Every structure is written in C-alpha cells, then in structure tokens.
Amino acid sequence: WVTPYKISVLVLLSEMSKNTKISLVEKRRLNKQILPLLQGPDMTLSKLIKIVEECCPNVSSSVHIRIKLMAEGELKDMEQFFDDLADSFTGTEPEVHKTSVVGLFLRHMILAYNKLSFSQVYKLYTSLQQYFQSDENLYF
C-alpha cells in the first residue's frame, strides 16, 4: 500500500508544516487544498510537482530535492525519513492529528510501513529510486 507517490505526499506534508515563508493560518488553508492528493490515485513525480507548484510555489522545489536526496542516497535515508516523520507530529506543535484526513494518512502510512518485511522495504526504496529517475529522465 505504501508507494513512492505516497512517500512524496508525506514529504509534501512534512515540507508544508516546516514552511517558514507562510503563516500557520495559511498552512491550515493549504492543508485543506492538498486533501485530494491523500485520497486520490498514484501519479508520477512530474505531475505531483506541477500540482504543488500551483498552490505552494516555495515547497515544490523543497519536495522535489528531498526525494532527489533520498533516491541519490541509501536505503537508510528512506528509513530515517520515516523515523523523523513519526516524531514530527502530535509531539512538536503539539496538535492532535488523529481524526484528521492528514492524521489518518500519517497513521496509516507509518503503520503500513512498520508492518514491513525487509524484502518489501528494500523493494520500496528501489521503486522510489526508479520513481525519481523517471522524472529526472524527462526532456522537459
């Protein structure tokens, strides 16, 4: 269930909460605008970045480069993203994201990730590298 697109959405959610150039009110508005990405089907990294560029022009590049560094890194870099993301909510603001669409998405992604199989985690990281590579290969 956890795919490179879903990881990219987690990266987007993380980058949105960290954005130093918009207010907390604007962040709350943007989290509402982003909801169809959490509920919709998987899309290429190229399409996701194009969507993010339209509503969050700042974070689009930050999202793109974060995936780039994870893909150009090692398996540990994907595992470290999941660890840091799990410690980043309901214990930083500290706002309860439990009944929320974002909260349920963060929960269901971290749970499905942890109920791994080392084989499945390794195949997830390679899938992520190919997902990023597919965007990097584009002429445009």
Numbering used by the authors: 29 to 168
Source paper text:
The structure was determined to 2.2 Å resolution using single-wavelength anomalous diffraction phasing. Apc5N [residues 27–161 (human Apc5 numbering)] adopts an all α-helical domain architecture comprising seven α-helices. This α-helical domain is capped by α7, orientated orthogonally to the α-helical domain. In the crystal structure, residues 164–168 from the TEV cleavage site continue the α7 helix, similar in structure to α7 of human Apc5N defined in the EM density map. Residues 1–26 of Apc5N, predicted to form two α-helices, are disordered in both the crystal structure and the EM density map. DALI searches revealed weak structural similarity to the RNP assembly factor, although the biological significance of this similarity is unclear.
Only four subunits are directly involved in catalyzing protein ubiquitination (the cullin subunit Apc2 and the RING subunit Apc11) and degron recognition [coactivator subunits (either Cdc20 or Cdh1) and Apc10]. The remaining 85% of the APC/C mass corresponds to scaffolding subunits, of which seven are large multiple repeat motif proteins (Apc1 and Apc3–Apc8).
